[PDB]
Design an enzyme around this catalytic site. Sequence first.
Site, PDB file in Angstrom:
ATOM      1  N   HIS A 189      15.569  25.658 -44.520  1.00 34.00           N
ATOM      2  CA  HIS A 189      16.147  24.607 -44.073  1.00 34.00           C
ATOM      3  C   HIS A 189      15.263  24.126 -42.747  1.00 34.00           C
ATOM      4  CE1 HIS A 189      19.956  23.870 -46.299  1.00 34.00           C
ATOM      5  NE2 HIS A 189      19.658  25.296 -46.256  1.00 34.00           N
TER       6      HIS A 189
ATOM      7  N   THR B  23      20.509  13.971 -43.437  1.00 32.25           N
ATOM      8  CA  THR B  23      21.241  13.840 -44.429  1.00 32.25           C
ATOM      9  C   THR B  23      22.261  12.510 -43.956  1.00 32.25           C
ATOM     10  OG1 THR B  23      22.635  15.357 -43.987  1.00 32.25           O
ATOM     11  CG2 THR B  23      21.439  15.698 -45.650  1.00 32.25           C
TER      12      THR B  23
ATOM     13  N   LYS C  62      23.599   8.739 -45.725  1.00 34.18           N
ATOM     14  CA  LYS C  62      24.891   8.187 -45.418  1.00 34.18           C
ATOM     15  C   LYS C  62      24.914   6.902 -44.955  1.00 34.18           C
ATOM     16  CE  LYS C  62      26.246  12.640 -43.833  1.00 34.18           C
ATOM     17  NZ  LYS C  62      26.719  13.488 -42.636  1.00 34.18           N
TER      18      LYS C  62
ATOM     19  N   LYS D  15      23.972  12.353 -34.400  1.00 35.10           N
ATOM     20  CA  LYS D  15      23.503  13.943 -34.987  1.00 35.10           C
ATOM     21  C   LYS D  15      23.372  14.987 -33.763  1.00 35.10           C
ATOM     22  CE  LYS D  15      19.611  11.407 -36.169  1.00 35.10           C
ATOM     23  NZ  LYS D  15      19.276  11.956 -37.556  1.00 35.10           N
ATOM     24  N   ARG D  16      23.386  16.231 -34.023  1.00 31.57           N
ATOM     25  CA  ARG D  16      22.915  17.307 -33.207  1.00 31.57           C
ATOM     26  C   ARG D  16      21.925  16.805 -31.933  1.00 31.57           C
ATOM     27  NH1 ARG D  16      26.428  22.028 -33.382  1.00 31.57           N
ATOM     28  NH2 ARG D  16      25.215  22.658 -31.663  1.00 31.57           N
TER      29      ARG D  16
ATOM     30  N   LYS E 139      14.612  15.760 -32.316  1.00 37.59           N
ATOM     31  CA  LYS E 139      15.126  14.448 -32.848  1.00 37.59           C
ATOM     32  C   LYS E 139      15.042  13.203 -32.089  1.00 37.59           C
ATOM     33  CE  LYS E 139      19.037  17.000 -35.365  1.00 37.59           C
ATOM     34  NZ  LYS E 139      18.980  16.716 -36.683  1.00 37.59           N
TER      35      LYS E 139
HETATM   36  O1  LIG Z   1      21.619  22.589 -39.966  1.00 32.51           O
HETATM   37  C1  LIG Z   1      20.741  22.772 -40.016  1.00 32.51           C
HETATM   38  C2  LIG Z   1      20.446  24.086 -38.893  1.00 32.51           C
HETATM   39  O2  LIG Z   1      21.838  24.796 -38.750  1.00 32.51           O
HETATM   40  C3  LIG Z   1      21.794  25.945 -38.098  1.00 32.51           C
HETATM   41  C4  LIG Z   1      23.005  26.430 -37.805  1.00 32.51           C
HETATM   42  C5  LIG Z   1      23.096  27.820 -37.566  1.00 32.51           C
HETATM   43  C6  LIG Z   1      22.045  28.562 -36.937  1.00 32.51           C
HETATM   44  C7  LIG Z   1      22.094  29.929 -36.471  1.00 32.51           C
HETATM   45  C8  LIG Z   1      21.030  30.745 -37.111  1.00 32.51           C
HETATM   46  C9  LIG Z   1      21.371  32.193 -36.599  1.00 32.51           C
HETATM   47  C10 LIG Z   1      22.002  32.376 -35.396  1.00 32.51           C
HETATM   48  C11 LIG Z   1      23.221  31.448 -34.997  1.00 32.51           C
HETATM   49  C12 LIG Z   1      23.149  30.345 -35.562  1.00 32.51           C
HETATM   50  C13 LIG Z   1      20.753  27.972 -37.381  1.00 32.51           C
HETATM   51  C14 LIG Z   1      20.667  26.587 -37.714  1.00 32.51           C
HETATM   52  N1  LIG Z   1      19.312  22.446 -40.462  1.00 32.51           N
HETATM   53  C15 LIG Z   1      19.517  20.935 -40.962  1.00 32.51           C
HETATM   54  O3  LIG Z   1      19.559  21.388 -42.526  1.00 32.51           O
HETATM   55  C16 LIG Z   1      19.983  20.270 -43.236  1.00 32.51           C
HETATM   56  C17 LIG Z   1      20.384  20.347 -44.570  1.00 32.51           C
HETATM   57  O4  LIG Z   1      19.152  20.995 -45.229  1.00 32.51           O
HETATM   58  C18 LIG Z   1      18.779  19.270 -43.188  1.00 32.51           C
HETATM   59  O5  LIG Z   1      18.872  17.983 -43.672  1.00 32.51           O
HETATM   60  C19 LIG Z   1      17.934  19.076 -41.557  1.00 32.51           C
HETATM   61  O6  LIG Z   1      16.906  18.624 -41.652  1.00 32.51           O
HETATM   62  C20 LIG Z   1      17.961  20.479 -40.872  1.00 32.51           C
HETATM   63  O7  LIG Z   1      17.852  20.568 -39.676  1.00 32.51           O
END
Ligand SMILES: O=C(COc1ccc(-c2ccccc2)cc1)N[C@@H]1O[C@H](CO)[C@@H](O)[C@H](O)[C@H]1O
Lengths: 807, 807
Positions: free
Chosen positions: A348, A647, A651, A539-540, A545
């Site tokens: 991802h 994503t 939406k 979004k975050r 971004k």
């Molecule tokens: O949401 C994310 C990443 O979220 C996290 C969530 C948690 C962690 C994390 C990892 C290690 C320790 C603590 C937290 C790292 C990343 N990525 C997004 O994934 C979507 C689904 O594939 C994509 O549409 C987005 O481009 C992408 O940024």
Amino acid sequence: QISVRGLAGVENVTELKKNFNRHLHFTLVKDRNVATPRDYYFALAHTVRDHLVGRWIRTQQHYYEKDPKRIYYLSLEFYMGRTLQNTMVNLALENACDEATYQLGLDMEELEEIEEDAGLGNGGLGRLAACFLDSMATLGLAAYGYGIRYEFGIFNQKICGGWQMEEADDWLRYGNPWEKARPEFTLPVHFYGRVEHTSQGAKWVDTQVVLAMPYDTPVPGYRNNVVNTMRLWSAKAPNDGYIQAVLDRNLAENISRVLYPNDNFFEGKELRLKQEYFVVAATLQDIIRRFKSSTNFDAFPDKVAIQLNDTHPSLAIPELMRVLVDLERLDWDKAWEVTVKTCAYTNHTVLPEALERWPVHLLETLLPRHLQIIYEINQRFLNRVAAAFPGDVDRLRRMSLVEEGAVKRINMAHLCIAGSHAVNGVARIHSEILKKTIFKDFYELEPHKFQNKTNGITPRRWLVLCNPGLAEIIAERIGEEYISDLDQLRKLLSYVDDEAFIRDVAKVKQENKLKFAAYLEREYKVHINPNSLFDVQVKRIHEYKRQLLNCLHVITLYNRIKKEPNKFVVPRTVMIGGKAAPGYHMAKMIIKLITAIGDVVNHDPVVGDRLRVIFLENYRVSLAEKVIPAADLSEQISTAGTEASGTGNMKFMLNGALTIGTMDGANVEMAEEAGEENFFIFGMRVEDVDRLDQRGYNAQEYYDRIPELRQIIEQLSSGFFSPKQPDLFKDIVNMLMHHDRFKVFADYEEYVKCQERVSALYKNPREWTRMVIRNIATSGKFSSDRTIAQYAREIWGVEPSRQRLPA
Amino acid sequence: QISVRGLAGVENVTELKKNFNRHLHFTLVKDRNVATPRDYYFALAHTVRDHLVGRWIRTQQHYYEKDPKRIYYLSLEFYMGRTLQNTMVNLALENACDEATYQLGLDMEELEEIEEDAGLGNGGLGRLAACFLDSMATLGLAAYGYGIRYEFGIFNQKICGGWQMEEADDWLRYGNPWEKARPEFTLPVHFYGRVEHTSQGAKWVDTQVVLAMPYDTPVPGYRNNVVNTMRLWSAKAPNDGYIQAVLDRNLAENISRVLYPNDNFFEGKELRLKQEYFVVAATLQDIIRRFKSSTNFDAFPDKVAIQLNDTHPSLAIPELMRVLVDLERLDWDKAWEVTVKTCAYTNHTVLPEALERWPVHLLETLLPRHLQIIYEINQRFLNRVAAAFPGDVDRLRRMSLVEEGAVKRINMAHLCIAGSHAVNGVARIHSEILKKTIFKDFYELEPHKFQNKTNGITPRRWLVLCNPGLAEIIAERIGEEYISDLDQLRKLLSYVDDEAFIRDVAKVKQENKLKFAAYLEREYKVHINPNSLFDVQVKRIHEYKRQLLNCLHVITLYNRIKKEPNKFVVPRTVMIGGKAAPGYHMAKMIIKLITAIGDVVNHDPVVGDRLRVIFLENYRVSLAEKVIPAADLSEQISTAGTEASGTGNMKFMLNGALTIGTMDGANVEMAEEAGEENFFIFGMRVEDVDRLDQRGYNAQEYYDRIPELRQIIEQLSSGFFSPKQPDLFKDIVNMLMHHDRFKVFADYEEYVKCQERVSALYKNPREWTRMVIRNIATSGKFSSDRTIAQYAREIWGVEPSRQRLPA
Ligand SMILES: O=C(COc1ccc(-c2ccccc2)cc1)N[C@@H]1O[C@H](CO)[C@@H](O)[C@H](O)[C@H]1O
Ligand SMILES: O=C(COc1ccc(-c2ccccc2)cc1)N[C@@H]1O[C@H](CO)[C@@H](O)[C@H](O)[C@H]1O
């Protein structure tokens, strides 16, 4: 009231009414005299849940009798949102409950607002898992989601003095009517200890034990009577001064206490490693137990697929090896074949700081046996690399699972590629970047492993549930079939010149905006003009971004108005929302800048209601369901090459907003589906970014050559937006000028020009709406039903089915 | 099957069967193919609970309409045991459930064994609260039990190598079907902070806040359709690194985590003080809120009584003052009058080390405002003492609430006497000792405050539930009325010469013993002879209770057998059971001695099955319900003047055991009710103990003059009972010889002689049984219905009622 919400038959309504009164009395132990709106919500939730149970039992019985290949989706995040309305939608109960509650003197919509989001995720990756579960059930797959039951999900965001404050998301306080505790299926998970070698092989001894207690939540398919399971693990201390020893049970149970909210920048925290192993060890014992209830692990990959949602559950690979080698006593090579054929890995991101790289000293202490196995995997893998590319010693170092340096680390992405038969990215351009750059060496060794699976969203939650008005005007023309076959929306292309449809599409959007404008006042005492263009970026908060680029545009518009106040401009309401990870200083500063711009802009008499800047507090799944149907313009403006898919973009397209964006992530495929003429594309492509990096990005060049940009920077530096603290934003200016990895200035001119073209089109409502129709009509590709059918056929080796189970 | 268990009508049975299948399906989400015995237990529990709800709602509605004076029983302990069978008994559902489950192919008794005890107490004081709730509901009083919902109750006791080991009582693991969470009635409790003085009076500011969340459990009366509430408070953190701050919420929630198990020797631990204030602050806000839902606090004592179960909730007194003075702004003297008229205090001990004496520095920090109020109470009280007894400066020091010394302490008993209109002991001799010795000064100042309320037990749990066979043979002769009017048992005096009744009484005892002997083998692989006399001492392990004296008797019998092996002796099974407080070394050593004697005695071929010594592991309410019906001889052998009442003694009398005991606690009243000829009384009276103390107790004198006693002491010292560790028991010998506060040797000769008279009588089964009948027939006084009627009339100012509420 509306057709897509189902039938309200006299028998059904009468039955719903009595079961509601039964739950209010026997379940809640209340009567109508003391019941609060929360009691009514619970009585309704239990009433609807009762309709799930028969189908849940028979679905699971069906899988036992037929013994299909099972899909196990392992994720540390399931960003589910609310469950009540989704369950009604999928069971065709919505109109009946509405009627039944109306007759009881209650407003169902009001009761719906009482439910807490299950906020068990950060953003896109967590919400993808939730859409995927919905699609797997709708496509009749024997699928199980496995994760952690966090006591506290993503924090509630409050804004105080323009600043984010975090409070605990205590989502379980009032209880969760959807889950069923399964204390009888409790399983032990081991930590620490040491490795002993015998004649019989290795033994992991002297471990501390934490119990994993499962909680099951039903996942209903769309009108097919399929109900799958999401099983979430909760940590419990085993039963063996006295007082202090009792209180120390907290230490063990902390494993499932809270979701890590840092979705950028990986940090190797011990408690997170424990969470990762905990979900993996309990899940794999459950999988194996189920497989045995059918000696011959050869058939294991014919009956089990394990999908890894990023590297977060990557410990599944050495844990499966541990179990097969140490417990089942299989030889290494046979175990490895089984493992590889069983596991697949979805990537991802491409940002180097986001990859999990666990310090060896952490694994050494917490999981000594797993570290031995990883070393063995690495030795065998690098032996294969050496044979394929003899003499290429640098390749050996680049591909190693073990990274040398200050502290030795394990690269979990390299582990995942080595131990999976399939590796996929989440949009065509992302998957190509994986093959060409960051995993190039791996692709050259094993080209057949690398796939694309472009992301999607479920049209149940993201159209029927959140935008019933739009769903209805579509059903009127083309029927209801499109809800589980979204490609049928293309049929709408023959209505692009249909005057009635144009008017109806525009009317639904206006109604959504009036509703959202009203929500804002009632719940947040904020005044907006509903005739303005709704310009939204939710979004975050991340530098990549580029919320900051949007900020620069907002200030440009403000400066232009102040410069020529009596000139007509298309009125806008610019809304920006999203949470910042608690440790991310720059993201917290961006939130404060947004509110600071609002303070100035929103109270300037010269501006009037021509421009408004609003920060949408506490953005989460329930709020997205409200704001997305109300949007005219969707901001998808990440630097080319940085957003793996997106994503939220999908939406917005499905709900009648036009998109301004870069050629990044899934934006490329969206523009390709709709036609580039129907999309507001601007800015550098990935190739342009590469060329800039070769030469060296100098932000000063832009500042020097763009007078309007220079004005914004002086305003920021001099304290125009922070009168009492003139240097509040010096970190922001400094970053923009000297260390901007995301080249905000380089896209600025094109972005502003493109935004002028947006405003021009919005002046012509008829042509704006015709472009909207061409977007909605070509959004079919981005249904998560399409995504899951491709996973099933190209990775899992299973055929989806649209057939009903008996009711 | 048996009459007292109620009717099994076709309509009722059919309805119970369907609701059972409904809960199994909808509530548990199981079918008959996967259901375990635990699932069946839960389906039954929910089915029975459904019968409570209508009556619970209407009872509480009734109190609202009629607005009677409310009774609030504040206890830190509610030793409830299991709930399922008790609920069936009180709702007359027992035979119907039995039939219904039998038809479904299930054994109800087996399902009953699945329920966890609610072990929220240590022993007698906690079980008294539980009996009292049952009697208050049966007598139609508007009564509420208020306490703490401990996550972990009294520890489970395991015996390993003869030693007690403690494990966590995780009684909530599988859920509790009896309780209803009331998250909406949550209340704040304050700690720490500081006191500010304004013009308006004092203000308590800068406090930390813990939330109190109530859980309600129904308390059914015996066949009167009354269902009262027990409300138990649970601690929750308020919602305001990030991760660590979330994990630190544990600190707040630890308040309700675990019951303190040290029921002898008070220790001032901060966490216990927090528990005590927590229950008091949340309870009093609830009381006041309810009173307002009826300005005029003058009527407060006409509508509220607060009973303090020992000094554990003594903070109610200054908390009520705090609220009336600081919040409601009443003047001091008016507030004080209200408080005194509202509160009453029950005392439960005379051992000086058991009295709560809180260090001033603890209160200063935790509750600074309460300490100011206590100082003010003390100053005003001592001003009254000085006026009544001018010049008596030593009285002033003896009566002070503040004790001087190394650390200044607050005497919570003195606070309780000063702030209550009634003070009672728990048996006639105890109440007299209170007036004559430990509270003599207080009695001279305010003689009208001092009362007796002799303890009782509920004949529902302690006869009908645990001994249905005996309940039935009694109902056959005299009808069913005695179950809620236990004085009717006197009617049995006319059956003392009735041959059929004698045979039936003896048959029921034999059946109870066969059942218990079978339970022992199946669940603990231990072999006993059911024709032996069952000699039982079950109660918490304490030096004052003199398990040690019983040990000396057991060894005497063993030595006698070894001395003259071919002489006939009445066979015995000596059973001793009870938990030791984790910090109490001597009590843990006594447990080890008991098992050590067992090791020798139980494996000596010369003894055969003439003597057996068994340690009953994990003694608790559910085990008492099994062992008490099986007992022939009840050991009640505390040193005269030390057991305030006892209640286990009453349970044995009601269930057909004869009593060997000292003239201590309620034993005196029991012997007086039955006639001394029908009781095995031995040993020093309180007067004899006093005379011994005046002269000085010298244990050596007994050792010198009693050859059989000298032999036992040499066996212990020399390692006869611990061959591999000869000095294992040196602490025990040393204590007996040099520092025995409880004069074990002084009662030894009389105890052994008295035990010979027991054995003589048991040889004559007909005369043994006739004496048993005279005991059962005179046990009526010791019903907790009698106790509660006296509390209601003489303390609370309310009239009990036997009338039914409409069903
Ligand atoms: O949401 C994310 C990443 O979220 C996290 C969530 C948690 C962690 C994390 C990892 C290690 C320790 C603590 C937290 C790292 C990343 N990525 C997004 O994934 C979507 C689904 O594939 C994509 O549409 C987005 O481009 C992408 O940024
Ligand atoms: O059970 C008890 C005392 O139990 C406790 C329980 C808890 C504590 C305690 C006190 C402070 C801190 C921690 C624990 C002190 C004593 N007393 C018994 O009360 C019965 C009911 O009145 C009487 O029949 C017994 O004689 C008496 O010993």
